[PDB]
Design a protein around this ligand. Structure first.
Ligand SMILES: [Mg+2]
Ligand SMILES: [Mg+2]
Ligand SMILES: [Mg+2]
Lengths: 334, 334
């Protein structure tokens, strides 16, 4: 596998690619003007040290911010409407906070908390303008708990972990399916219209498990409460031992990669280093020669379809996080 | 002056200089192994995108962390013992937190809060092992409030600002001296053993005013409480109009420059941009050809006296912060 330094070199190439093509208003080079194209941009560009570019994204985001602290438009992808609406808001909060844009992060995080279910601790899947039944999902809840950790709302993070532990315990058929949604009372939803990961098939969706593993490990680091470490390690064993190989190969595997890298630094267990090395090396290998990532395109393009742009910023972030946790883990343990 | 891109270029050269010479345990290349040589390193290296080097400083800092969350040793400079002990801890808390080292930042911040005076909101000048009279100073209080902002302990930040307001209002002779310290009841200390800036002389110590200006401006951004913007504005007016021109020339002027850059982004007042540009250009002009900053050193050296190492990391941070607030200020206002 490639070294932590090589993972970082790859992240820097993509960050440079984004910055070279950033628009004057600060938007990143997407073929459609949608918030799901650049919600990871502030955090990703800041970790690459492109802080003026990251601040320009913050300027762009601030120009879209509504009085309630939400960015309800522009949104087109329905996963950002009724599956995990807050997935955009969570990265926006973290990126704003780490940049010191404390007014933006306060407003964003306060809106996120209006979508918290006080009884289960989960976060609602569908946004305010989107009809739904109050279901909460593992991804909305996980990213919201992580944003709460960065903004110091540790009680909210703990309550999100309560939701996740209940989702985990209540699974009716864990060998074959992970049902990632609970209803407004906290019962696991097995409806056809609720997100369900096919555990023993190569059909993606793994970040509904991997993002919880990352968040729970971060929450353990913040509190040293072993209950959170226990659930994170149980989720990682599940993805490693019980899920299809696709869990570490699909484009959504980066979340588990970060979780394994962090678990490695915190516990020193060698399997966690291997998982994170393997995932980081895989993302590095898929990078296009010109510096971005794309499902289908390979040329010297000037912009990307929103999903590739998001994936490109996302891998800047995961390669950086995997890199620094593996490098520190080697210093601490080896 | 110099463009925001030019300031960032100087910061990046200095960060590269540091990282090339960083030691295997994570320590920065100081001729003496003291915490005051590298307390700004986590945050500075993170802003430069050098996240593996920043995390390596975190590993080093973590190895020194005591059970109470303090790093009482190694310390040698008196200013880090009984003038502003917590000045190290404050940057360490911010750098740990933005790196996601949430256990480190929680423990560091919680120790910082045990040195808060609950009656005045000030932070004690002398560490637990250092005999003293409970006096509290503007720098300890300012950096501790800023660390509270990054960690989401906003009530602690607001209480720090209350202290700074009492210190400002209580000045007995502000046209001639800025007494930066108060006793444990919050009365301004005028004894000869208490830090006093000779504001009509070119004799340094300006950061006892400039760091408060920066913190209060960030606290305004977090809360939108104009009382904090008002006090920041009065301190910047004071430094610009009542203080010797050395206030924007001395090595400690970077704090004021950052406050001015931030105030420019928030208010658009052109005088703030001029102050920030003037200070950033001055720092960029003083940089060595190799990347470090030093009062006396001019060779291609492998290490530095702790004060020069601290100053080099410090200018990486301030040039980055000035540059991105000036670049976004231009986008918003120009
Ligand atoms: Mg570069
Ligand atoms: Mg099994
Ligand atoms: Mg080209």
């Amino acid at each position: 596998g490639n070294s932590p330094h090589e993972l970082k070199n790859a992240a820097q190439r993509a960050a440079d690619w984004l910055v070279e093509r950033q628009r004057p208003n600060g938007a990143l080079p997407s073929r459609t003007a949608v918030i799901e194209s650049c919600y990871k941009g502030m955090w990703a560009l800041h970790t690459a040290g492109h802080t003026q570019a990251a601040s320009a994204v913050a300027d762009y985001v601030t120009s879209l911010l509504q009085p309630d602290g939400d960015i309800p438009q522009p949104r087109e992808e329905r996963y950002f409407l009724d599956v995990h609406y807050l997935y955009a808001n969570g990265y926006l909060t973290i990126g704003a906070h780490v940049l010191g844009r404390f007014g933006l992060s306060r407003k964003l995080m306060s809106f996120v908390e209006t979508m918290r279910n006080p009884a289960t601790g989960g976060f609602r899947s569908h946004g305010p303008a989107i009809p739904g039944d109050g279901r909460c999902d593992s991804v909305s809840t996980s990213i919201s708990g992580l944003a709460a950790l960065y903004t110091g709302r540790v009680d909210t993070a703990r309550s999100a972990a309560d939701f996740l532990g209940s989702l985990w315990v209540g699974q009716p058929d864990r060998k074959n399916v992970f049902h990632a949604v609970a209803d407004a009372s906290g019962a696991v939803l097995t409806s056809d219209d609720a997100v369900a990961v096919q555990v023993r098939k190569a059909e993606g969706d793994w970040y509904f498990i991997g993002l919880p593993a990352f968040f729970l490990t971060a929450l353990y680091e913040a509190t040293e409460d072993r209950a959170y470490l226990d659930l994170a390690t149980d989720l990682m064993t599940y993805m490693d031992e019980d899920c299809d190989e696709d869990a570490f190969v699909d484009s959504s595997c980066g979340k588990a990669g970060v979780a394994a890298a962090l678990l490695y630094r915190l516990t020193g267990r060698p399997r966690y280093r291997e998982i994170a090395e393997g995932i980081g090396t895989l993302l590095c290998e898929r990078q296009s020669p010109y510096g971005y990532w794309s499902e289908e395109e390979t040329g010297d393009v000037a912009d990307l379809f929103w999903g590739d742009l998001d994936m490109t910023a996302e891998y800047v972030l995961w390669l950086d996080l995997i890199g620094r946790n593996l490098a520190s883990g080697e210093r601490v343990w080896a």
